[PDB]
Write an enzyme that holds these catalytic residues in place. Structure first.
Site, mmCIF file in Angstrom:
data_model
loop_
_atom_site.group_PDB
_atom_site.id
_atom_site.type_symbol
_atom_site.label_atom_id
_atom_site.label_comp_id
_atom_site.label_asym_id
_atom_site.label_seq_id
_atom_site.Cartn_x
_atom_site.Cartn_y
_atom_site.Cartn_z
ATOM 1 N N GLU A 188 48.471 51.667 41.058
ATOM 2 C CA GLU A 188 47.673 51.721 42.150
ATOM 3 C C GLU A 188 47.095 53.002 42.629
ATOM 4 O O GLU A 188 46.317 52.988 43.526
ATOM 5 C CB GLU A 188 48.758 51.330 43.186
ATOM 6 C CG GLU A 188 49.413 49.971 43.080
ATOM 7 C CD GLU A 188 48.229 48.859 42.983
ATOM 8 O OE1 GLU A 188 47.351 48.703 43.789
ATOM 9 O OE2 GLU A 188 48.644 47.637 42.318
ATOM 10 N N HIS B 82 44.051 31.046 37.467
ATOM 11 C CA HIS B 82 42.487 31.788 37.558
ATOM 12 C C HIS B 82 41.641 30.709 37.486
ATOM 13 O O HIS B 82 40.651 30.839 38.319
ATOM 14 C CB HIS B 82 42.358 32.658 36.353
ATOM 15 C CG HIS B 82 43.442 33.986 36.475
ATOM 16 N ND1 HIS B 82 44.662 33.875 36.100
ATOM 17 C CD2 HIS B 82 43.325 35.218 37.251
ATOM 18 C CE1 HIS B 82 45.097 34.920 36.467
ATOM 19 N NE2 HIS B 82 44.468 35.813 36.696
#
Ligand SMILES: *[C@@H]1O[C@H](CO)[C@@H](O[C@@H]2O[C@H](CO)[C@@H](O[C@@H]3O[C@H](CO)[C@@H](O)[C@H](O)[C@@H]3O)[C@H](O)[C@H]2NC(C)=O)[C@H](O)[C@H]1NC(C)=O
Ligand SMILES: *[C@@H]1O[C@H](CO)[C@@H](O[C@@H]2O[C@H](CO)[C@@H](O)[C@H](O)[C@H]2NC(C)=O)[C@H](O)[C@H]1NC(C)=O
Lengths: 593, 99
Positions: free
Chosen positions: A356, A486
């Site tokens: 991150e 997805h």
């Protein structure tokens, strides 16, 4: 003149946009950290205002003609602004498509499969079925969970997919694309100076070319996994056959990472886990982020901002506000960079913090660029830059350097082999599934696959490409792909494949930059300022330039290369070749028990 | 309430101020004094917020410009009182008269 008018229009747009985007991002952050009805409605109004302004500017931007614009940066900004997306269709069609998407999202979220003969035990996918796929070893229970979720989701979602494909095809044709697959492949299109030109059609062939090279390593991994599963399941798996769909450690077979206890090379040797060492030394989330910051400054990337430390949440708040567990890196705009992660003191969270922070560093580097160009070069690049930091952070050299791992630690070949196998199960295994799924979606959108033969094509390709066979025959009333998250929620899947190629390419380029003389998997990029500058040249660009130019800037090549991926997995590849000599490498298309 | 001029026909000369709010005409067509496509109001707003990055936080700037002219200079630094010692031979500087 048209170019000057576009420049003034973009100058007015950036100032208005940055403020509205910041308001939307801040409202979204306030909802994510402090979940409530009022923050949700505030987020709804902020997003509504930002979207309305963005569409109004896009409609004005479409008046400009790109033929008489010479400068590439202005043309790229106008190209980014002019993408109408779903707004191209009429209100009735757009509303129908939105209704189909919303019903698909809610039905997937609320998906229910329940125990036969035991009515009270009804299970959702997110709390319990995933646990069954990750941990359970019973063949019948896995067969039940896989078949039941496949039956309920496919039967309900087959008509919805049938009109979903048609509506997406209409939207793509309305946006001057051949099909929805071409619309997705547009994201990798680069228009630029000679030799940097990339086409949508090229991408499919490039993926196939990379796949052929990846295929021997995958075949050896598949054979080893098949033998170990055969040891686990004595008579239900054939030596020459494909793997059963429900024995791959996941609901869909997307990741093979849950097969590591069954398929461990060396049971006796422990993992490289350093959680207990963090517990002994009293580490906390702040120290984890500080160590990540130390790594980033050491490699030569800039320090974290004061706003990042002041405004981010790195711990569960525990003051009565609900939060989202998932770690997310936020670029709110106007130099505001935040990370939302509920960090526990574990090795996985430490690697996630590095990932991150890599996302935040990538966001920070292109802040100089204009607002429309403050994005990644493509979808894969943004994930790849975080992944290389995650790769470097987990090395034994990095853990020894920072005192997590003892100074006298001995790195034998066996720990490298089992760690590489775990990395392959997470990383190599996902690639055939990703390629097969994207190829199926592209051919379905194109119309190459006939409408009534969809299921018959998909299993065949899974037999041809993934080397995984269906446990039970499925007719065309089923919609077996749609069970994945997805595809049911309209997300592109090729980004993971590109991410995987880019991650190893970037890692080899940085290791060559850092003058590491050893195996690629043991490489650490700490204390190598030249590598940081080499990376930062790509990071500063954003999507101002074509992604091929950025790829050349890091690795010296203008296309996807899987030679770094093979180089990373070379000891494991040699080991798999050494142990597969008696066994048969490869699978047979026909269904073998 | 903090504004800046984003669009002007010509660059400003040194120590010049423009307070005009006239719509900036970037296109051949006349604006007509009403905001319209290719016609943008010159003064944009600095939307300051506490959580912005250091580059974008509000900064107050004071520019001190010193000029000398043929007229006698009347802005000069402090004058030191020092202290007064009497009955001894001391170098005296009284209002620029030395001895
Ligand atoms: C990147 O560079 C930094 C700075 O040179 C490296 O940190 C340094 O690591 C060494 C070895 O762990 C430290 O040496 C020893 O430190 C202990 C604890 O203070 C001391 O008792 C020993 O006598 C010896 O001095 C060194 O102090 C330390 N320096 C700093 C400023 O922390 C880091 O290891 C490098 N990373 C890589 C991957 O090369
Ligand atoms: C979480 O959100 C709630 C509401 O969204 C916040 O409560 C508000 O706090 C402000 C500031 O004191 C008050 O003016 C409002 O009247 C409060 N609203 C309600 C409904 O109580 C709360 O402060 C937020 N918590 C954090 C830690 O940000």
């Amino acid at each position: 003149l048209t170019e000057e008018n576009a420049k003034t229009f973009l100058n007015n747009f950036n100032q208005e946009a940055e403020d509205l985007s910041y308001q939307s991002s801040l409202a979204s952050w306030n909802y994510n950290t402090n979940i409530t009805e009022e923050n949700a409605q505030k987020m709804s109004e902020a997003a509504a205002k930002w979207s309305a302004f963005y569409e109004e500017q896009s409609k004005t931007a479409q008046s400009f003609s790109l033929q008489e614009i010479q400068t590439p940066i202005i043309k790229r900004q106008l190209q980014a602004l002019q993408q109408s997306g779903s707004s191209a269709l009429s209100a009735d069609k757009n509303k129908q498509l939105n209704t189909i998407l919303n019903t698909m999202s809610t039905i997937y979220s609320t998906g229910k499969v329940c125990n036969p003969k035991n009515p009270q035990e009804c299970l959702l996918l997110e709390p319990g079925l995933d646990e069954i796929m990750a941990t359970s070893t019973d063949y019948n229970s896995r067969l039940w969970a896989w078949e039941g979720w496949r039956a309920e989701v496919g039967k309900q979602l087959r008509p919805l997919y049938e009109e979903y494909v048609v509506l997406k095809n209409e939207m793509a044709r309305a946006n001057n694309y051949n099909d929805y697959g071409d619309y997705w492949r547009g994201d990798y299109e680069a228009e630029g100076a000679d030799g940097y030109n990339y086409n949508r059609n090229q991408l499919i062939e490039d993926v196939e070319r990379t796949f052929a090279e990846i295929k021997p390593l995958y075949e050896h991994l598949h054979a080893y996994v098949r033998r170990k599963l055969m040891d686990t399941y004595p008579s239900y798996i054939s030596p020459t056959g494909c793997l059963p769909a429900h024995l791959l450690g996941d609901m869909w077979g997307r990741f093979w990472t849950n097969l590591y206890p069954l398929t461990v090379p060396f049971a006796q040797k422990p993992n490289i886990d350093v959680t207990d060492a963090m517990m002994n030394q009293g580490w906390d989330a702040e120290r984890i982020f500080q160590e990540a910051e130390k790594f980033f400054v050491s490699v030569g990337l800039p320090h974290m901002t004061q706003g990042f430390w002041a405004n981010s949440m790195l711990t569960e708040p525990a003051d009565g506000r609900k939060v989202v567990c998932h770690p997310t890196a936020w670029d709110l705009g106007h130099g505001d960079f935040r990370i939302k992660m509920c960090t526990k003191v574990t090795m996985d969270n430490f690697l996630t913090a590095h990932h991150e922070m890599g996302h935040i560093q990538y966001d920070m580097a292109y802040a100089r660029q204009p607002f429309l160009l403050r994005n990644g070069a493509n979808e894969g690049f943004h994930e790849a830059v975080g992944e290389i930091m995650s790769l470097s952070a987990a090395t034994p050299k990095h853990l020894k350097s920072i005192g997590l791992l003892p100074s006298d630690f001995q790195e034998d070949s066996e720990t490298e082999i089992n760690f590489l196998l775990k990395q392959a199960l997470t990383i190599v295994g996902t690639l055939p599934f990703t390629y097969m799924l994207e190829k199926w979606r592209w051919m379905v959108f194109r119309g190459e696959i006939p409408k009534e033969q969809w299921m018959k094509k998909w299993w065949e390709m899974k037999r041809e490409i993934v080397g995984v066979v269906e446990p039970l025959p499925h007719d065309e009333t089923y919609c077996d792909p749609a069970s994945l998250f997805h595809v049911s929620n309209d997300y592109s899947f090729i980004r993971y494949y590109t991410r995987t190629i880019y991650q190893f390419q970037f890692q080899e380029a940085l290791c060559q930059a850092a003058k590491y003389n050893g195996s690629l998997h043991k490489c650490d990029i700490s204390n190598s300022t030249e590598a940081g500058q080499k990376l930062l040249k790509m990071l500063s660009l954003g999507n101002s330039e074509p992604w091929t130019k950025a790829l050349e800037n890091v690795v010296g090549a203008r296309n996807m290369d899987v030679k770094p991926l093979l180089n990373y997995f070379q000891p494991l590849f040699d080991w798999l070749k050494e142990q597969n000599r008696n066994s048969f490498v490869g699978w047979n298309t026909e269904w073998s028990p | 309430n903090y504004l800046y001029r984003l669009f002007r026909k010509s660059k400003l000369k040194p120590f010049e101020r423009d307070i005009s709010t006239e719509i900036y005409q970037a296109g051949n067509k006349p604006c007509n004094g009403v905001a319209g496509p290719n016609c943008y109001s010159p003064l944009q707003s600095y939307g300051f917020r506490p959580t912005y990055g250091v580059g974008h936080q509000p900064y107050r700037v004071v520019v001190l410009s010193f000029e000398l002219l043929h007229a006698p200079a009347t802005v000069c630094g402090p004058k030191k009182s020092t202290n007064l010692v009497k009955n001894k031979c001391v170098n005296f500087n009284f209002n620029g008269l030395t001895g």
